């Protein structure tokens, strides 16, 4: 489910 | 009062590298992700990359990869943008803005954008 | 990439009448989450872009009834209600539902006084 900081959580 | 505040305007010789900075006040800095776009002067932007500023992890377009390389200052809040090797291309005007981290609802406040002129 | 389209290049309009910005996507801009990420911009000549809609249809703060965005999955289209001799801009549409994060054309809006 979860995998980068680049990316908003809700993505 | 929530300040995305950009490097000025500079003119640099081709082949020649830039920091243009973007420095925020007024808001939780790394609480929202700082993305640069590019613009040629009468066209349309174009994403070159993304910082995290609370962990350092940079994303970047693949025209602008190894170009562009994105470096944050946790210490004074100012992310960087280093563009290497320059050319007559190049001359655009750079915006950044900020993008929240924990939910995407746009590119909230943008800087003034930092034009920069490559030539000889 | 998700190649972004916008509709008109240039959009003739008169103080008081309607105008409708039409943007169209290569794939589906709605992301497995099950959110349309498509946000509309405002390029004043000479200022920097600042942002009208932002998830398809919900509008930015200190932004006037009559803009209003609506759409879905790959045709999204922007309206204002009537035209005020402040709206003169060019107006971005942007996905960020995919990376690269692309941007339209821009239709520039003209006042017809």
């Known amino acids: 489910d979860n995998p980068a900081s680049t990316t908003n959580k809700d993505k | 009062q929530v300040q995305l505040q950009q490097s000025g305007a500079e003119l640099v010789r081709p082949g020649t590298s830039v920091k243009v900075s973007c420095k925020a006040s007024?808001?939780?800095?790394?609480?929202?992700?700082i993305q640069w776009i590019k613009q040629r002067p009468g066209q349309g932007l174009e994403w070159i990359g993304v910082?995290?500023?609370?962990?350092?992890?940079?994303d970047y377009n693949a025209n602008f990869k190894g170009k562009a390389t994105l470096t944050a200052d946790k210490s004074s809040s100012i992310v960087y943008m280093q563009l290497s090797s320059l050319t007559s291309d190049d001359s655009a005007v750079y915006f950044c803005?900020?993008?929240?981290?924990?939910?995407?609802?746009?590119?909230?406040?943008w800087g003034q954008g930092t034009t920069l002129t490559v030539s000889s | 990439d998700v190649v972004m389209t916008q509709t008109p290049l240039s959009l003739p309009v008169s103080l008081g009448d309607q105008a409708s910005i039409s943007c169209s996507s290569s794939?589906?801009?709605?992301?497995?989450?099950?959110?349309?990420?498509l946000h509309w911009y405002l390029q004043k000549p000479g200022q920097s872009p600042k942002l009208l809609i932002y998830?398809?249809?919900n509008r930015f703060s200190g932004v006037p009834d009559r803009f209003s965005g609506s759409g879905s999955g790959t045709y999204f289209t922007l309206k204002i209600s009537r035209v005020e001799a402040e709206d003169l801009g060019v107006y971005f549409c942007?996905?960020?539902?995919?990376?690269?994060?692309?941007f339209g054309g821009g239709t520039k809006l003209e006042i017809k006084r």
């Open positions: 803005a900020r993008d929240f981290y924990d939910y995407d609802v746009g590119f909230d406040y």
């Open positions: 007024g808001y939780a800095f790394t609480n929202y992700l």
């Open positions: 910082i995290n500023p609370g962990s350092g992890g940079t």
């Open positions: 794939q589906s801009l709605v992301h497995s989450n099950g959110k349309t990420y």
């Open positions: 998830k398809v249809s």
């Open positions: 942007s996905q960020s539902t995919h990376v690269p994060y692309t």
